[PDB]
């Protein structure tokens, strides 16, 4: 189970991979039985093909960067604030998000929860 | 059940109450049978009696400040998450801690669960 320092590293790596847009490398970070709730409040996505499809839809000119430190626990979990910059039909947008993640004993993402709503979106 | 906007206001209010150190007002924001996990990974404390004891031990010695360090992220199912920093004293030393709280509210606008993400990696003296 990743240590607190290791959680900080894995969560920051996740943001770096979103920022470059490497869907394959993102999906590799997930465990077989992982779930993604994004935005939190929506039904969970599960299944490796389904998680890949989610990232392909979302990322298929998106940029993302941490906007504060990763907060990590001693039980393989963490939470991080970040901002996503995207273009909607040629229009620059930004979205503030916090992801909460639980990692398994192999260092793979078991659960991803992305908190945000329209109150967090600007143009 | 608070809307997204209402979650933003409640969670911001919470930080205001921590910042001023109003233990009773904090405890009244929680559901009577709420759970707190702080830091997340430690066993849950249950109920306003235990939660009050927790906030009294954390705040009742004064000198705590707390402020949001980014916007509250809110959902449409009465939940939210926020980044903040707490400034504290350790026997005369200034301390600071970066935290993210996640909260779920009940159908009465009270905090049903709170999870506070941080560890010593987030602590600076």
Curated annotation (Swiss-Prot), chain B:
Protein's UniProt name: Steroid Delta-isomerase
Record-listed E.C. numbers: 5.3.3.1
Impact upon substituting residue 90 to A: Slightly reduces activity. Reduces protein stability
Active site: 14, 38
Keyword entries, A-Z: Isomerase, Lipid metabolism, Steroid metabolism
Subunit structure as annotated in this protein's UniProt entry: Homodimer.
Induction text: By steroids.
UniProt record, GO biological process: steroid metabolic process
Enzyme class: isomerase
Catalytic activity: a 3-oxo-Delta(5)-steroid = a 3-oxo-Delta(4)-steroid
GO MF annotations, alphabetized: steroid Delta-isomerase activity
Classification via Gene3D superfamilies: 3.10.450.50
InterPro entries named among the record's database cross-references: Ketosteroid_isomerase, NTF2-like_dom_sf, SnoaL-like
Binding site for substrate: 101
């Amino acid at each position: 189970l990743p240590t607190a320092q290791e959680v900080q590293g894995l969560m920051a790596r996740y943001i770096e991979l979103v920022d470059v847009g490497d869907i394959e490398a993102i999906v590799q970070m997930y465990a077989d039985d992982a779930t993604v709730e994004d935005p939190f409040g929506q039904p969970p996505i599960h299944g490796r093909e389904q998680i890949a499809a989610f990232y392909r839809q979302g990322l298929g000119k998106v940029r993302a960067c941490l906007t504060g430190p990763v907060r990590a626990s001693h039980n393989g979990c963490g939470a991080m604030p970040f901002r996503v910059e995207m273009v909607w039909n040629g229009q620059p947008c930004a979205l503030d998000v916090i992801d909460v993640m639980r990692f398994d004993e192999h260092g793979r993402i078991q659960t991803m929860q992305a908190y945000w709503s329209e109150v967090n979106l600007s143009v």
